[PDB]
């Protein structure tokens, strides 16, 4: 399922730098109406045209309320254009790989070597989180929030 954020639909316009090499960042967040479950390709936010992540800070509230929680979040780039409500869209494990932020609601940063090696594209790609493993007891209305530090005009 696709749980679309404000930025993915386009109601909130994401910031894009003007100077080359400048660092910009807007926190991409949602308010989960329901309890997350495996397969939800949450389209948290969008990476603008010519940008590469330089640092990604992922913070969530306590997304599981069960002993030995299993919920894990994978953050990556998605294939199709932004805002297309088509289930045939796949996430990635680039920014984060089987991270365990949601077990205790902590904050972790990009700790994968592949995070900063993302290559450029010419069109607006969408950064979306996928719950690889379903939680033991899903939470009703907690918030998942990314923070992307992307730079334009890198060589």
């Amino acid at each position: 399922a696709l749980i679309q954020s404000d930025f993915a639909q386009g109601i909130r316009m994401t910031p894009v730098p003007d100077c080359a090499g400048d660092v910009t960042a807007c926190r991409f967040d949602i308010t989960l109406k329901n309890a997350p479950a495996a397969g939800d390709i949450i389209e948290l936010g969008v990476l603008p045209g010519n940008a590469v992540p330089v640092e990604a800070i992922l913070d969530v509230d306590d997304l599981d309320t069960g002993g030995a929680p299993t919920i894990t979040l994978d953050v990556g780039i998605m294939s199709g254009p932004v805002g297309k409500n088509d289930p045939a869209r796949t996430c990635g494990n680039e920014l984060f790989a089987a991270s365990t932020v949601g077990q205790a609601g902590g904050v972790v940063r990009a700790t994968a070597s592949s995070a900063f090696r993302i290559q450029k594209a010419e069109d607006h790609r969408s950064v979306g989180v996928k719950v690889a493993a379903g939680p033991a007891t899903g939470a009703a209305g907690k918030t998942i929030a990314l923070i992307l530090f992307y730079v334009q005009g890198t060589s």
């Binding site: 003007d18 100077c19 080359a20 090499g21 400048d22 010519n50 010419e122 005009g153 060589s155």
Partner: protein, 53 residues
């Protein structure tokens, strides 16, 4: 009044250009110069058409 003369050479700028629609502001070239100096001194000599005999 001066003991030296210095004159400059401005070599070509040799950076990689920015392809596509990527922003260019901030990735600005730095002109490079080179200098050389010339030092002046006296060079004298003397001849003696000497002797009265």
């Amino acid at each position: 009044a001066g003991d030296r003369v210095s004159f400059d050479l401005s070599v070509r700028l040799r950076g990689q250009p920015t392809f596509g629609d990527d922003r260019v502001e901030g990735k600005e070239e730095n002109l490079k110069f080179y200098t050389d100096e010339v030092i002046i001194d006296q060079v004298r000599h003397s001849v003696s058409a000497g002797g009265r005999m």
